[PDB]
Amino acid sequence: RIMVQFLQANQESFGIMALASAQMYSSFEFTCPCLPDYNYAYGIGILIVPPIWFFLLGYVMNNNISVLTEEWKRPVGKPAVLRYMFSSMTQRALIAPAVWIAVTLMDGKSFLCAFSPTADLSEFVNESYQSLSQKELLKIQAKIPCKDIFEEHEIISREAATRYIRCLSQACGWTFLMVITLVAFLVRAIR
Amino acid sequence: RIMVQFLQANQESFGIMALASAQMYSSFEFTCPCLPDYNYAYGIGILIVPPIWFFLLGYVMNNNISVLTEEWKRPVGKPAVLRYMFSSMTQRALIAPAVWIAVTLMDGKSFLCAFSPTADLSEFVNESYQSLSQKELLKIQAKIPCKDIFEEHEIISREAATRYIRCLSQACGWTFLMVITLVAFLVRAIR
Amino acid sequence: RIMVQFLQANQESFGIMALASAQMYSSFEFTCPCLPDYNYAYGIGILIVPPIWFFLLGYVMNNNISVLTEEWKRPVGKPAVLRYMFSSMTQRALIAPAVWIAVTLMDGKSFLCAFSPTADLSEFVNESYQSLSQKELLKIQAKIPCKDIFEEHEIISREAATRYIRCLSQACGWTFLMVITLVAFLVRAIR
Amino acid sequence: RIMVQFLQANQESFGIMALASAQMYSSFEFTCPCLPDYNYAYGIGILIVPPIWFFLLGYVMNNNISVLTEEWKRPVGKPAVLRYMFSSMTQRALIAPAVWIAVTLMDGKSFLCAFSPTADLSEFVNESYQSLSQKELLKIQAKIPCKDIFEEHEIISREAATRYIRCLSQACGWTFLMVITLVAFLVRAIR
Amino acid sequence: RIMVQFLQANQESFGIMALASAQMYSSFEFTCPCLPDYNYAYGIGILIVPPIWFFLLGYVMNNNISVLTEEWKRPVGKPAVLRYMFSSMTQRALIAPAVWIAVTLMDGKSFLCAFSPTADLSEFVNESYQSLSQKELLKIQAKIPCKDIFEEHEIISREAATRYIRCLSQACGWTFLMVITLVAFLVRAIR
Amino acid sequence: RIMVQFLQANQESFGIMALASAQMYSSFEFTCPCLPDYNYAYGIGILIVPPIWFFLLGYVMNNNISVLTEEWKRPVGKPAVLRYMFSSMTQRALIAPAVWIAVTLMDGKSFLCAFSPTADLSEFVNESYQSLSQKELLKIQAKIPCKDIFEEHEIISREAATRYIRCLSQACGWTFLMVITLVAFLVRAIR
Amino acid sequence: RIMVQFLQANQESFGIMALASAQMYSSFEFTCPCLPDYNYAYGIGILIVPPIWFFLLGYVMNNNISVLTEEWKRPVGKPAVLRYMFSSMTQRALIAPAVWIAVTLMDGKSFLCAFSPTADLSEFVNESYQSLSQKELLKIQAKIPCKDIFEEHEIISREAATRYIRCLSQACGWTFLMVITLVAFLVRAIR
Amino acid sequence: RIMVQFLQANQESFGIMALASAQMYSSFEFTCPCLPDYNYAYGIGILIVPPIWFFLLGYVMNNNISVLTEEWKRPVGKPAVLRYMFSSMTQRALIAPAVWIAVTLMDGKSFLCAFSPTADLSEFVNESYQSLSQKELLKIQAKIPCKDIFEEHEIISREAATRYIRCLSQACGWTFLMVITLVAFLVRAIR
Numbered sequence A, B, C, D, E, F, G, H: 001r002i003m004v005q006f007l008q009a010n011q012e013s014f015g016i017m018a019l020a021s022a023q024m025y026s027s028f029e030f031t032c033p034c035l036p037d038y039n040y041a042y043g044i045g046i047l048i049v050p051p052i053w054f055f056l057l058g059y060v061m062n063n064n065i066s067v068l069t070e071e072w073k074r075p076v077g078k079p080a081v082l083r084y085m086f087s088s089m090t091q092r093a094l095i096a097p098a099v100w101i102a103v104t105l106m107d108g109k110s111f112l113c114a115f116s117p118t119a120d121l122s123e124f125v126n127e128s129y130q131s132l133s134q135k136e137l138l139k140i141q142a143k144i145p146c147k148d149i150f151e152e153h154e155i156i157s158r159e160a161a162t163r164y165i166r167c168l169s170q171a172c173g174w175t176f177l178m179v180i181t182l183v184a185f186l187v188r189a190i191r
């Protein structure tokens, strides 16, 4: 509900592809497969491929890609403005992927789905079953991001590990935001 | 509720047939027949025939199809602009079917209805009835997309297979979106 | 709730009689009599007579029917434009009945009320009472479209047959829409 | 709730007395007396006298009734336009009563209150008390339109007869609408 | 809730004192004292004195009462227009009391509070206590319009008599409306 | 909820201090102390001192009180207009106190808090404890306006006396309104 | 909810710092520490320091404090207007603190938190524990303003003392308002 | 809910980065890890790094940082206005971090997460386990800010310590606000 709330707040306060990516995330049914084999793949895919598609889309929506390919295709184009126009296009296009990554990291769903089956959750596993094959722990830990599937509360506290992984995800998200802001500052200060 | 939410978000942010197809999907009562004989037919039909109707409709709503058929009908028309006008009409018309397919794939209802009776769900079938005729499994698996009909929780976990098939559907949807975006990029870069 | 939702969406997106028929359907209390003698009559009547009334109404609301009857009544009218004006009036009037039929077919209430008592529901009738007089089955099947009246769950699963008949109705509705769109395409391409 | 919904839809789509009558019906507390002596009187009265009052009101709100009575009162008026003006006034006034009758017939409350005590409900009366004095059946059937008063479910199924009478009322309403539309068509085509 | 609904509908459709009286009734906490001595007084008072106050208020809000009293006070006023102005003022002022009376009669609260203790409710009194002093019946019948006070369901059915008295009140209200409309028609047709 | 409803209705229909006093009452947390010593004081205070403060405030908000005190302070002011200006100021200021008193009387909270401990409630006191010291009745009757404190239902029916006192309060309120309207009529008719 | 209601009413009716202070109070999470040592400190602090901060803020937001300090700093400023400008600034700034104090006194939360542990609540303490060390009563009375902490209903009725202290707070608030209004009247009448 | 309420109130009343930080806090899912090792780190991080990022962002969004770095980079710039422009930029940028810190201190979530495991809560620890190793108390106290994890109500009252720490946080927040306002007053009065 917080994501939809901030969506409405951004709409009220309101370059546009940022809101598009935010809305698409807030209205995308993230469903972790909750299986030890496809958890990592699904999480990393949701993290990686939507920003790639947003990058391509931002390139396509640009009204002057045709002139770029026309000049790049000719031997002697009717040239410097070309590099500048291409850099401007790339910079305008890179906004939506960054917004998507930041949003999906602050909301640690992809991180929880991806890193649950293999993470080291030893402070959460009950003291009784503290000696059992990690292959048995694989399925149980993989079922963690699923509320309606995880029916083994006697072995692992679900919320206790959920909060831990979500905090790690939020830390990674803030680190990403800081690095991106530093790079943007350097770019705006040099070029 | 997510589909209606994104519908309202698209309305707020707001060529028009895209919103028409999105609204028609969000307000269409998808009812899987939940029978081993008509599941596949119904799913594939909901996937296939609505985009065909949208294609035809987009052709009909075009204001200058009459001039196209008039020129194609004459031996010597009062011609090149004809191919260009036809290509432009087709490109404008192809938008709504793609939006419909993308929406109905991201929301894996048609996929779940179509591929449930014949898919290989062996990790979900209970260990007790792990040796029984696939003809008996046919009806049970066909009843999966129906919440109020599937009353055999002792044989197959419904949600566990629902998430699996829905994840496969979302993967197919993202693949479709990527391919369509690549084709659109090539088209806008060449012609 | 889906019908009212699409009504509001159409109002937001917004020749006018289409919305009138949609609203009138979404606000009409369809009550199947749930009797073996009047089910068919009521269903077919709700399917047939409202579009006839809409046709007549669309003819009446037309501002230039008076000139049409004046010219048709005279021996030598002060004539060709007459056939064209009449065809245009008929084409404008035929919109609301088609919208009504499409809506009431996509929402398989009339179909369920009409075809329930005589349809062949043998895969749904319980295995115990699989040998009983069809005259006894008549009343039970007729009571199917009534949630608060059908109190014989031990003989027929209500939802299982409801979904089946509703799917058949939706198939018929899509077929009707496709045929109508093809005819409209031919008309706009020829005349 | 359907009546209020269509009221709001009519307000959104929006000679005016039609909406006035619709609103007055949707906000009028219809209370059937549920007594064998006053049921018929109350139902027929709600059906008959409100349209008469609407007719009189529409005559009163007309701004040029004074000139009509002035000319009708004089021996030689300062005359043909008189008949035309009177006919136009009557036609404008006759709209609200028709709307009231149509609405109160489509919503079979008046019909249910009026015809319940004397109708022949023999397929609904339980098989046990299938032989008892019609004088005893009078009170029971009269109590049918009252949900909070009818406490004799062991003798007559309330909903089963309610649906039957309401279907009859809706049939009568559609017949009335068709006849009125035919008359309006003839009037607009002749005069 | 119906009164507030029609209040909002009147506000949307929207000489002004009519809406004022309607709003004041819909927001006035009618509390029947439910005592055999003050029931009649309270009901008749709520019926009678608010329209008197509305009449006086409508006279006061009139901007030209000062000139009326100035001319009526002088021996030879600087006269015919006086009678006309006074009649116009009275006619404009008489609107709000009529609206108040009509509203409070259609909503049979005042009638129920006033006429419950002395009315003849013999078909509703239980057959067991069908022979008891009317002085004992006085308190019980007086407690009828109070839902949270009437705790003698074994002697009189509350809803059965409530509907009866409310129907009588609605009949009286419709009679009042018809008489008022006839008088208004005669006035507008003569003067 | 009725007070807030009429507040919103007044806002929609919309000299201004009247709405200010109405809003302040509808948003003021009236808390009767429910003690035999402070009940009367609190009720009469809520009835009396807020209108005094409103009177003073209306005098202060007046933009030309400075000229009034300047002229009243001088021996020979640069005089008749003074009496008229002062009377106009007083008449404009007297509106809000009257509105406050009328509102707080129609909503018999202050009356109930003030007159409960000493009123004669003998028809409501149970027949068992019909002979006990009035000093014991003092606390019980004082606790009447408190729903969550009055825990002696076996001695006095709370709602039965609440309705009685509230009806008396509403009678007093209507009397006050009538007297005020008569005085206003006389003032507007003389001066 | 009453505070937010009056906030919305003030916003609808709508020098500005008054609404700012009202909003800040209605959206400030008042949490009494419910300890015998910090109750008084917290209550008096919430009563005292926010108006001081509002005073300072109103001084800072003033656009011409710089000229004031510039002239006060110079030996011979390029002087009388200085005293007038300073008085006007102070008078404009003193509004928000008064509004804050009035609001937080009418809503007797600070008073209840501050004066509960040491007040004399002897009519509320149960008759059984009417003889016990005031040191034991200290903690119990301090826990009074906390609904979820006060678990000693057998010793003191919580609501009975809450209403008493809240009534005292409202009396103090009305006294403050009257004194402030009198001072404002004198100021506007003299200077 | 109070934070969102004040967000909406600020939006209605409505340099812009203040609302941005407020919205971002009200829509940020604060999740305390509830572990004795990461509690302090997470709390202090949420308190410290978001204002740093807001500072950097406010520097980046400034349209004339490029001219600043251009002049600072040159040996002899085409200089005094430089220091003034830089000071103005820094002052404009310092607003959002202060708003973030004030908001997150008034809402004592970060303080509660950070200082719970090591604070001295001896008046809240039950009298039975008043003698146990502080290492055992570490985990229990760390679990305090988690409602769904703290399942040791027999050792420490959760709400009693929550209110205490939240009150300390609010005191610190008000102190911070006072110091910031004093510094702003001095700055606006000197420079």
Ligand SMILES: *[C@@H]1O[C@H](CO)[C@@H](O)[C@H](O)[C@H]1NC(C)=O
Residues within 6 Å of the ligand: A126, A127, A128, A129, A153, A154, A155, A156, A157
């Ligand atoms: C740990 O397991 C034991 C039994 O093996 C059970 O009683 C206990 O509740 C479990 N505790 C947790 C925290 O899982």
Ligand SMILES: *[C@@H]1O[C@H](CO)[C@@H](O)[C@H](O)[C@H]1NC(C)=O
Residues within 6 Å of the ligand: B126, B127, B128, B129, B153, B154, B155, B156, B157
């Ligand atoms: C599997 O079947 C057994 C009995 O055949 C039943 O007790 C158990 O609950 C079932 N488990 C699942 C996951 O279906």
Ligand SMILES: *[C@@H]1O[C@H](CO)[C@@H](O)[C@H](O)[C@H]1NC(C)=O
Residues within 6 Å of the ligand: C126, C127, C128, C129, C153, C154, C155, C156, C157
């Ligand atoms: C079929 O009938 C038997 C008894 O005749 C009953 O126990 C069973 O539940 C019924 N099943 C269905 C699906 O109607």
Ligand SMILES: *[C@@H]1O[C@H](CO)[C@@H](O)[C@H](O)[C@H]1NC(C)=O
Residues within 6 Å of the ligand: D126, D127, D128, D129, D153, D154, D155, D156, D157
């Ligand atoms: C009919 O009456 C019998 C007893 O007389 C009762 O058991 C049965 O439920 C009733 N059925 C209906 C449909 O009223």
Ligand SMILES: *[C@@H]1O[C@H](CO)[C@@H](O)[C@H](O)[C@H]1NC(C)=O
Residues within 6 Å of the ligand: E126, E127, E128, E129, E153, E154, E155, E156, E157
């Ligand atoms: C009538 O009274 C009898 C006992 O006197 C009671 O059993 C019955 O329920 C009552 N019926 C009504 C309708 O009050």
Ligand SMILES: *[C@@H]1O[C@H](CO)[C@@H](O)[C@H](O)[C@H]1NC(C)=O
Residues within 6 Å of the ligand: F126, F127, F128, F129, F153, F154, F155, F156, F157
């Ligand atoms: C009156 O008191 C008796 C016992 O003293 C009790 O049983 C009865 O319910 C009470 N009635 C009322 C109306 O208080």
Ligand SMILES: *[C@@H]1O[C@H](CO)[C@@H](O)[C@H](O)[C@H]1NC(C)=O
Residues within 6 Å of the ligand: G126, G127, G128, G129, G153, G154, G155, G156, G157
């Ligand atoms: C007073 O205390 C007694 C026992 O000490 C208890 O039974 C009673 O309910 C208490 N009453 C109040 C009002 O606290």
Ligand SMILES: *[C@@H]1O[C@H](CO)[C@@H](O)[C@H](O)[C@H]1NC(C)=O
Residues within 6 Å of the ligand: H126, H127, H128, H129, H153, H154, H155, H156, H157
């Ligand atoms: C303190 O502990 C005892 C048992 O050790 C328990 O009965 C009591 O409820 C506890 N009280 C609190 C306030 O934790």
